[PDB]
RNA sequence: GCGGGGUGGAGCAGUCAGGUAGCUCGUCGGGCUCAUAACCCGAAGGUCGUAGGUUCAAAUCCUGCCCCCGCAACCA
RNA sequence: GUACGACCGCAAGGUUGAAACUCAAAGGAAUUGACGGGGGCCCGCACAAGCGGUGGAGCAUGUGGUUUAAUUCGAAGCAACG
RNA sequence: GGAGGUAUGAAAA
């Protein structure tokens, strides 16, 4: 997807269309669970009432029809999770540093006595 | 070293978050400004010339001298 | 006390460097009334101190003690249902008093094995102004800053 | 862009304060606010904000190129003297003082009293 | 026969979309209080109904099974 | 200030107005205390400012609880519990 | 000095 603008811009016209994408799948499902929750009450209604198992076949069509058109919402992508956590116990004095110089060979010494703690 | 090269901006932030509330020492070296403050860096060591100090705003008065 | 200020007990001071800032500073090291023990640890880091540098170790305290001393303080007040702090300038007495107590508490926090090395790198630290002590100092003013909206009170 | 004369409105309530330097026909030039320094909550009404909101203000005025203003005091608030004397620290000289709080001939009701 | 459910003491997430067992209240212990309540600090409490498959890995997917809830079990 | 009746009111309700039954008090003023999330003025390691502790661990000891043939009796906020 | 307006705590002693 390219957008016109800069990064907020994208983040701005992003959020928003992913926004608008999730109201649509709520409003398709909620319409789904009414028809479903109809077609049930017909399913578990007594035999003798010819009209209502009638009716709960004729919305199961219309159910049928709308889990076939029914938006898939997109996972969302997941985020890295870190939980670092020491096997031992630090001290108060990790790491010593003491009058240390180095130079690799063949160029001026980067530090000299570099000491500490 | 640079520990937050090369990843995605949501990576960093969790990256950085997470070394906060690590229970241990961290040497770090970054050039990300957002990442060293949410370590929230203690001491900094200057280089070239050698200067163990307290981490602070200061380390703009280095950058800039 | 609610009479009224008490006298302030005086100090001698410090038989080889004749400070009273000296014996201020073996009294907040000392443990038990073991002042023996307290004098060989503070003379011994001055040792250390002139030795490390050159300068009189005496100066050097004293730098350190410029360096920690504070100058406005946060002292907390109750009005009505909300508690928050207000910014108070320090006598000089409670100036070296908070001195001297960062000085030695952080000390004691080192990590170096002996106590005369671990007040002997504090006191450097601190003439230098850096370090736990003047950590301390900087925190101090920067709650008083922060809170210097209150400063009427 | 250069104005010389101005009039600098300080709107001070129980809980902010304001002050507004506009020219002498009252176009806004540059303005400020306790909250809009930073300060939040109780630390809006502090005359310390005040005389911050005021130094702010005058020096956005000053870098327009202003020098002279007349101060107009309004509302009830504790930091009006504060932004005054942070205006004259600051620079503008202080031409003139006047209080504007609006004073109703009885007029319209008041909103009810507190704890009732 | 058609559905809905079995996760801590209770109520609920998490299930779709496989990695890590949670929220609320409640219980136990210790604080505060003259004492109770409220409040504060600690702790416990489930291998996710159950048995098998799938997987490197199952509370999560598949199959069956057992329980509990609602409906139905016949119309001129 | 209820019920019945009556009058008034669009209504809300107003005016008039009981009895059965129930208690040995209800009540006004003032007094002395105590008390107040009343006020004023004071004091005490009361807080504040500091030093060192307890609560965490092992053990000593007292207490509760539980147990027991008995676990003798007494002490129970401060002011019972080396 | 005086006037008006501006959480709980059982029963009996
Ligand atoms: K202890
Ligand atoms: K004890
Ligand atoms: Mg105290
Ligand atoms: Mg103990």
Redo the contacts with the bound molecule.
Sequence with gaps: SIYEGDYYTYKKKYSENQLLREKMIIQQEKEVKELATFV?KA??????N?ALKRMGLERAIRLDKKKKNLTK?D??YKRV?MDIKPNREVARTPLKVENVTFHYPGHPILYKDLSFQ | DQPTNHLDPETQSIIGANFNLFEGTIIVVSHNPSFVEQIGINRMLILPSGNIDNYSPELLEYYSN | ???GPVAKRDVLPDPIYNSKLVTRLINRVM?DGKRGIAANIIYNSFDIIKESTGNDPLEVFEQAMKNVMPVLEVKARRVGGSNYQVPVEVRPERRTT?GL?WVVNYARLRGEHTMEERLAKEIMDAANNTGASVKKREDTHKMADANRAFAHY | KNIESGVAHIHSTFNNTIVMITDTHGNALAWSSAGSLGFKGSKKSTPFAAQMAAEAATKVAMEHGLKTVDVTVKGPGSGREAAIRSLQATGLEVTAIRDVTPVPHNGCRPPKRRRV
């Design positions: 049930q399913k578990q209604a007594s035999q003798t010819h919402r996972k969302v999770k | 006390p609610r009479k443990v908070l107590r």
